[PDB]
Amino acid sequence: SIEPFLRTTPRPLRLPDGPLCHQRSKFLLMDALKLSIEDPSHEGEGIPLYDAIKCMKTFFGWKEPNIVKPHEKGINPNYLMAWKQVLAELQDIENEEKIPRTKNMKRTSQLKWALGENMAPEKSDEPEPRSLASWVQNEFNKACELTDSSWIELDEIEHIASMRRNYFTAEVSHCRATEYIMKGVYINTALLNASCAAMDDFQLIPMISKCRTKEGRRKTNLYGFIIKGRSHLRNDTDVVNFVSMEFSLTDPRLEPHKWEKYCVLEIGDMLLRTAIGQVSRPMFLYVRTNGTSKIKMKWGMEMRRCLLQSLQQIESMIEAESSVKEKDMTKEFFENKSETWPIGESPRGVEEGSIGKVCRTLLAKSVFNSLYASPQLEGFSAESRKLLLIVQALRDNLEPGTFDLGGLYEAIEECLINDPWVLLNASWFNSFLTHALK
């Protein structure tokens, strides 16, 4: 071997300095708030706008809306007028005997500003470097956590595979990341179908999900509304602009950097339980202009793929330790809950976790790869894998070739600009690296 002082120790990835990064998801994640109704037995899927109105009637604290956090780069009265127009159009729907399957809105000056002007019938890019904000890790943690509700539905009614899918499903059915899959499937289905069927119209689209309570009873959830803009989507890259209007209890003043793209309205008073007792807290509406494409909407409609792809990664882990002990450990892993995995960290060091925590962490990572999909992620993922293989080989005292390590770091650090998800993944790599070559 070469003298120890000549051996190359991989340095940390360098993250760029700059203003804290902002939320760029297509919908709210940890900050969402659901207005919900309990579905009739044998219901099925209702008329979305009928479910939307029923969900809104379960809230008793509606009040005159006001701007409480301006969008710095927006015309804030247009956001306030847009919300008042959604309420006026829902009232017009309520006043008709028959609730329609879709609703075309009046193309007012406020919506034209937010979405764009009429056009004749046919014959991410943000460049500045941003620093990693604490909210990204916090979002990821919330995605890994369990909800009171089940998000995966049973089907119509080989020992290993069946037992594995069932063990995995039991661990992730209540997982917040599973809520994000079903929320994403529903809204991308509604937006793509509307984009194809009503190319010129501004359609009012409820943001809906369904789940089952602890009591096995069916719930319909309303997160808010999207207004679709003009949608002549010829190629799969063509952008449809939309306005998102999303319920929340989050005070936007806590993390102003997170909410740079949004106008926040105060729309209601919510009665909340606290240790001391009952308190009135504001219900907010998070409003922004955003955009998506046929290909992104198709990916969103496919988000149940995250469940198969994360099950695959768990299967491989049970396969490796089933070889060594020459006895398939499936039952023992999910049953014993005695075997642990390094899955978390604190200032105190690495935190070991149950197989359940591993199932939910890998699902959350797959789902965040989909919600925050980007070219920078594809580059970071390919190049970072090459570095991880060198670190594993060094950790095992194998002396891998380091002569081109310089060119590998350049290719990875090229991907670290301003994407909140890629910057978190880079930070995660750094933490692993400090523990790997201790």
């Binding site: 890994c144 899955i343 978390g344 960290e345 591993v358 993944n425 790599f429 523990h435």
Partner: peptide, 10 residues
């Protein structure tokens, strides 16, 4: 804090 890259330590 959950960090899936830590799985590579085991």
């Amino acid at each position: 804090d959950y960090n899936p890259y830590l799985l590579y330590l085991k």
